[PDB]
Write a protein that binds this ligand. Sequence first.
Ligand code: FMN
Ligand code: NA
Length: 148
Amino acid sequence: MLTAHVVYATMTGNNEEVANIVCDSLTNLNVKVTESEISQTDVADFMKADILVVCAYTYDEGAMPEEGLDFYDDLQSTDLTGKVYGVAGSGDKFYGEYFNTTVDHFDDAFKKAGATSGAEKVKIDLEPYEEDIERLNKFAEGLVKTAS
Ligand SMILES: Cc1cc2nc3c(=O)[nH]c(=O)nc-3n(C[C@H](O)[C@H](O)[C@H](O)COP(=O)(O)O)c2cc1C
Ligand code: NA
């Protein structure tokens, strides 16, 4: 029944770890999941899933991943009405009001595209631990219930 595409942007693996946890939780909720890195993914292919997820870092005081700028821009130009989305990220709370700003940007981009938020965005500090894992499971549960 349900499909999902999880894209991640990463440099030291934390956000790929986050994407992996989300893919696992979705798979364990009987979702067929595609997972790919953002720079190797076209929005036209991404949008074919019922559930859309971006997991991406924040850099240089609030900067988006440079390899994800095209994907980000293409996302906002696409009609994603009927799609269920969620955004998550690992970042560093030391950057204060720049903590995981990329998560906020992608959540806004999905909003302009007309997609329906399936779960509250998840902002993780550095590596995901037990609490983060439980939060990413509720995240996945929210997407499935919203999409189904
Ligand atoms: C130079 C530099 C600048 C950073 N700036 C931010 C930032 O503005 N906001 C944030 O949340 N994290 C910032 N970070 C932290 C990364 O987002 C964080 O380490 C994240 O876990 C890396 O994810 P990745 O392993 O998937 O690449 C910065 C890290 C570095 C090295
Ligand atoms: Na472009």
